[PDB]
């Protein structure tokens, strides 16, 4: 009731109370690879045969605390092993770098796209790298 | 009606086996391929009979022999037509 | 109560794991038979008319 | 600019043609992938 808090509260409710249209759901940038389901990341890393470990999902990353440090997951992911998973940000940065450096020129990117789209329902078709 | 349609189907089967043998070859083992009378039917005459009834009994011996000496080019045509006569003869059975 | 929910946690894990494995087996053997059928369908030289 | 349309159709037909020609050794690869997936799930 002081001509500042009024519009403050007004903006708050005008920004948090809407009709939840699916047309307003906040969508992430295409270049930020951390917002990619962590199975896209693993399939990318596994397809281009990169050299990274797998990531810690979110349950394995909050599982790290003095109390959480006694669970089988911590003691299987933090001792001396080779399967030692990592934080999603690291794998996502490796993937992003191999994305911005390895490059492509069309004349083979498009016809492959068309052959892919026109055969979605087919089980027996050209695997474009496998 | 039932006899004619069942015989046409069984001959379709035998001709399909042969045509599949003929498709995957080299273009010179085709030209010299010959099948003896009978083809593997222990009661062979049926197929000839069928083919007669499909074309006629005048212009049917000509074809029955033309695929006895050129099974490579003249039995993807005798088969594409048995596969019309099966469909048509079953619809005729229904309509009557 | 904490003993009971400990048991519940471990039973739920066991359930989800065995579902995982049976489902992956079924999916691979599905894809196999679909590959078989789409292979033989490229072998037809004269199709059916209708 | 129909040359671009001709290029693209030629390439896509090329992909179809290559797959149909190699269609017999591009089918044991599928089945070895599948058999190893099966024996490794087991």
């Amino acid at each position: 009731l002081t001509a500042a808090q009024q519009q403050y509260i007004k903006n708050l409710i005008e920004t948090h109370i809407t009709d939840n249209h699916p047309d307003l759901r906040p969508k992430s940038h295409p270049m930020d690879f951390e917002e990619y389901t962590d199975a896209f990341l693993r399939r990318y890393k596994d397809h281009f045969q990169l050299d990274v470990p797998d990531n810690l999902t979110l349950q394995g990353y909050l599982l790290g605390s003095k109390l959480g440090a006694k669970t089988y997951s911590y003691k299987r992911n933090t001792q001396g092993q080779h399967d030692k998973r990592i934080h999603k940000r690291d794998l996502a940065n490796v993937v992003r770098r191999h994305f911005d450096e390895h490059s492509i020129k069309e004349t083979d990117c498009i016809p492959q796209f068309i052959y892919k789209v026109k055969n979605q329902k087919k089980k027996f078709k050209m695997e474009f790298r496998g | 009606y039932d006899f004619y349609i069942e015989s046409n189907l069984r001959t379709i089967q035998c001709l399909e086996t042969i045509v599949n043998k003929i498709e995957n070859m080299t273009e010179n083992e085709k030209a010299n391929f010959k099948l003896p009378p009978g083809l593997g039917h222990t009661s062979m005459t049926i197929y000839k009979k069928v083919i007669r009834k499909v074309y006629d009994k005048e212009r049917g011996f000509e074809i029955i022999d033309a695929l006895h000496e050129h099974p490579a080019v003249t039995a993807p045509v005798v088969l594409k037509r048995l596969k019309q006569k099966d469909e048509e003869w079953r619809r005729a059975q229904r309509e009557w | 109560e904490t003993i009971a929910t400990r048991t519940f946690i471990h039973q739920d894990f066991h359930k989800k794991v065995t579902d995982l494995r049976a489902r992956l087996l079924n999916r691979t053997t599905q894809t196999w038979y679909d590959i078989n059928k789409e292979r033989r369908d490229m072998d037809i030289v004269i199709p059916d008319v209708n | 600019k129909d040359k671009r349309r001709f290029n693209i159709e030629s390439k896509v037909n090329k992909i179809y043609q290559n797959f149909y020609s190699e269609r017999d050794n591009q089918y044991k690869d599928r089945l070895t992938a599948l058999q190893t997936d099966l024996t490794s799930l087991h």
Partner: peptide, 30 residues
């Protein structure tokens, strides 16, 4: 045109039932 109406209980079996123009056209527009 040789339409051949003769005695027929059944109809004649119908004739059984490339061309990347608008796709590459979409790519032009894009």
């Amino acid at each position: 045109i040789p339409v051949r109406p003769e005695i027929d209980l059944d109809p004649s079996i119908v004739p059984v039932v490339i061309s990347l123009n608008e796709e590459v056209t979409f790519f032009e527009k894009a």
